Amino acid sequence: VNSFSGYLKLTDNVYIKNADIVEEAKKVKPTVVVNAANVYLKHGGGVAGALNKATNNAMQVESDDYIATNGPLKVGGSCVLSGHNLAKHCLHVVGPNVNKGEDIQLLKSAYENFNQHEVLLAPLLSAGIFGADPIHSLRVCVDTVRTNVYLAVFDKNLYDKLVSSFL
Numbered sequence: 001v002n003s004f005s006g007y008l009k010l011t012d013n014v015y016i017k018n019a020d021i022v023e024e025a026k027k028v029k030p031t032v033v034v035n036a037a038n039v040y041l042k043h044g045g046g047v048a049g050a051l052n053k054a055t056n057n058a059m060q061v062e063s064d065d066y067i068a069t070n071g072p073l074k075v076g077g078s079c080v081l082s083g084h085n086l087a088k089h090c091l092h093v094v095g096p097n098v099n100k101g102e103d104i105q106l107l108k109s110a111y112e113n114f115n116q117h118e119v120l121l122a123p124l125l126s127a128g129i130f131g132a133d134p135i136h137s138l139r140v141c142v143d144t145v146r147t148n149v150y151l152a153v154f155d156k157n158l159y160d161k162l163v164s165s166f167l
């Protein structure tokens with residue numbers, strides 16, 4: 001049994017809800033919240049901007065030290081950092097950004113990072129300002145992630161479209 005409430009069950013392991021990921025993280029304090037990161041961990045907008053703002057910029061400070069030591073992530077890659085006030089840990093995952101011309105086949109590699117964690121609160125990777133089709137992102141999620149993933153869809157209109165179109 002876990003703390004997550006009000007989710008629709010899509011599959012054995014994937015759940016979805018119309019929710020503000022910061023507000024959901026603040027309520028649940030999950031072991032892992034996933035950030036929609038870029039390779040530079042520059043948390044300017046979308047999920048990264050929101051999450052970072054909710055940490056009062058502590059996520060960005062920690063991220064800048066990580067990059068100064070380790071250099072950029074790979075597209076499709078991830079790192080584990082603090083969850084600050086939102087979660088125990090934040091898994092920063094880099095999905096391909098279609099608005100930068102990155103290969104969408106890298107979306108499956110991105111979701112494979114979730115399999116290193118038994119339970120996660122996450123957004124749909126590569127959706128929103130990353131330019132990919134959220135319907136596609138949900139399909140790749142379901143077909144890739146085997147651990148228990150609780151997806152927070154920001155937009156109610158999009159949430160309803162994702163549920164109604166789910167095969």
Ligand SMILES: C[C@H](SCC(=O)O)C(=O)N1CCNC1=O
Nearest residue numbers: 046047123127128153154155158
């Ligand atoms: C990846 C999403 S796109 C819209 C969606 O999930 O419907 C995004 O930009 N944001 C901002 C805050 N929470 C989010 O998920």
